[PDB]
Amino acid sequence: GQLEQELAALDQQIAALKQRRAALKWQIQG
Amino acid sequence: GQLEQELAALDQQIAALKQRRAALKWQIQG
Numbered sequence: 001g002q003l004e005q006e007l008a009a010l011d012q013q014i015a016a017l018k019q020r021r022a023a024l025k026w027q028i029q030g
Numbered sequence: 031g032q033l034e035q036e037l038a039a040l041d042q043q044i045a046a047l048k049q050r051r052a053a054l055k056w057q058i059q060g
């Protein structure tokens with residue numbers, strides 16, 4: 001339902017942000 | 031620097047989304 005759609009959206013955003021964070025850390029840390 | 035400020039921003043957003051995700055998971059599970 002609506003709650004499940006919202007939870008899937010949060011899980012996708014979290015996964016994408018964790019990946020962006022890993023790429024930014026690599027740049028900063030060389 | 032600028033890159034570290036972007037990293038702190040990602041850290042804040044990921045932590046905040048994880049709290050929203052946990053609160054929604056609890057709603058779903060009753």
Ligand code: NA
Nearest residue numbers: 021025037041
């Ligand atoms: Na980190």
